[PDB]
Amino acid sequence: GSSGSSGEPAEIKIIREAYKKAFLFVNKGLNTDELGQKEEAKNYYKQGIGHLLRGISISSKESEHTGPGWESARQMQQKMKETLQNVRTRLEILEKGLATSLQNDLQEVPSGPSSG
């Protein structure tokens, strides 16, 4: 939806971006928290979290993709998968630290398809 040049596999070009923006909005969330702006901080993470997925949800499976560009791309991808798990926690201790009544808690994913 922008157009640039017919060179990248289209998939990588998307990972090289989702990785930057995903980490860009992150370095911001941490700052705010330090400044004393919980609200904003929560929002920042709410954005970076999305980009993380957009980059982790790419077709990185091909039986004919032997190139150096895919190497660095695969590396950055892993970074997110590691950052996210770390971000989720931050976005948790934050919300639970702001609300005084209730804010997303009582939850227990359905272990099985049916208790029987």
Experimental determination technique: NMR
Residue 102 to residues 46, 66, 98, Cα–Cα distance (Å):
19, 51, 9
Q: Could you count the other beta carbons within 10 Å of the beta carbon of residue 12?
A: 20
Distances (CA, A) of 105 to 7, 9, 87, 101, 109: 47, 42, 17, 11, 12
Q: What b/e sequence results for 24-56 when a residue is b if at least 16 CB atoms lie within 10 Å of its CB, and e otherwise? A: ebbebbeebbeeeeeeebbbbbebbbebbebbb
Query: Is 112 inside a domain boundary?
Result: no
DSSP string of 45-83, one letter each residue: HHHHHHHHHHHHSS----TT---SHHHHHHHHHHHHHHH
What does the block give as tokens for 114? 């049916």
User: Would residue 3 count as lying in a domain?
Assistant: no
Per the domain annotation, does 76 fall within a domain?
Answer: yes
2: in domain: no
Q: How many domains does the chain have?
A: 1
Residue type, 88: R
Which CATH number does the domain housing residue 44 bear? 1.20.58.80
- Do 17 and 78 contact (CB within 8 A), yes or no? no
